[PDB]
Assembly symmetry: C3
Homo-oligomer: 30 residues x 3
């Protein structure tokens, strides 16, 4: 149950921090 | 347990919407 | 609350993926 969705939320957290940076890239160059 | 998960998924739910706006805005700006 | 949680991160993982795609698209327009 919960160790499965925690590692998903972990994955989610990583992704969010990833995309956040990407958007910063785009915005500073666009 | 389930407290911290719903906690973080709201962080994530809002992060993800926030990004969707940045992407929408950025699409207009290219 | 457990099942709603697991399905909520479902949407998140899937929106995470389309943001990667839409931010990848915007990369070579800027
Ligand atoms: Na996996
Ligand atoms: Na509550
Ligand atoms: Na936090
Ligand atoms: Na969207
Ligand atoms: Na996924
Ligand atoms: Na992935
Ligand atoms: Na790049």
């Amino acid at each position: 149950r919960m160790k499965q969705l925690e590692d998903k939320v972990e994955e989610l957290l990583s992704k969010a921090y990833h995309l956040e940076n990407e958007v910063a890239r785009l915005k500073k160059l666009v």
